[PDB]
């Protein structure tokens, strides 16, 4: 998250911190995800597309910190790593950039809702907030494009939903942005999701309800003028989410 603010998982308790175990045992942060049900973390396929082996993944819920334990955090293996079969990613856009991680602790349990572990409502289908709506994005992604490190501390920021019209403008993303994506950016482009925020939630309040409107998917750079964050428009993937979480 470029700019925005540090936060803790209490402020995004559906936020799933998804890591990959490497051969050699190193565990790197992959992406955010959002707990959309106790067993289901939704994230971005691109986060996993190159390493689709579920066994490599560790999902934490209740994690406010990237490389240290957060009290009450839950560690999950990924029982199912469901990538969107229509995922595509050239050039820039990541299409159908949505992934489901069925999470299962070593105790065979899903997320146990706690102060730090909560699900995020999926939007009702094709029900997204209007452009200009401020939504939050959360992640452990880079705080600066040029950063090598991810923040240790979860961050959130607020970006405003950008209309598809605005976002497909050539000087934005042209046709890279689809209706299955939501662009969001800061008006000053000063804050944004960034690398490592992928998969994470774009949460809007569709009034009254914190709603997983978007999944951090892609963008050119981060907090780059005319380059919004692009989010998988979750409300356009409910059938897919439904058909895969049943």
């Amino acid at each position: 998250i470029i700019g925005g603010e540090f936060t803790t998982i209490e402020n995004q308790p559906w936020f799933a911190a998804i890591y990959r175990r490497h051969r050699g045992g190193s565990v790197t942060y992959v992406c955010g995800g959002s707990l959309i049900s106790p067993c289901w973390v939704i994230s971005a396929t691109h986060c996993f597309i190159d390493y689709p082996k579920k066994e490599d993944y560790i999902v934490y819920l209740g994690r406010s910190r990237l490389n240290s334990n957060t009290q009450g955090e839950m560690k999950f293996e990924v029982e199912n790593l469901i990538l969107h079969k229509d995922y595509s990613a050239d050039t820039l856009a990541h299409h159908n950039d949505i992934a489901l991680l069925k999470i299962r602790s070593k105790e065979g349990r899903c997320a146990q809702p706690s102060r730090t572990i909560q699900t995020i409502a999926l939007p009702s289908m094709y029900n997204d907030p209007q452009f200009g709506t401020s939504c939050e994005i959360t992640g452990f992604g880079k705080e600066q494009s040029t950063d090598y490190l991810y923040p240790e501390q979860l961050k959130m920021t607020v970006v405003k939903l950008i209309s598809h019209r605005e976002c497909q403008q050539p000087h934005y993303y042209g046709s890279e942005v689809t209706t299955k994506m939501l662009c969001a950016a800061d008006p000053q482009w000063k804050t944004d999701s960034c690398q490592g925020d992928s998969g994470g939630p774009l949460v809007c309040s569709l009034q009254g309800r914190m709603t997983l409107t978007g999944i951090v998917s892609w963008g050119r750079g981060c907090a780059l003028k005319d380059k919004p964050g692009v989010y998988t428009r979750v409300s356009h993937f409910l059938p897919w989410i439904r058909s895969h979480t049943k």
């Binding site: 996993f48 190159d50 390493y51 950039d97 690398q195 992928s198």
Partner: peptide
Amino acid sequence: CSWRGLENHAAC
């Protein structure tokens, strides 16, 4: 690769 979309990518 320094971009969202290439997290956890083989290259990158």
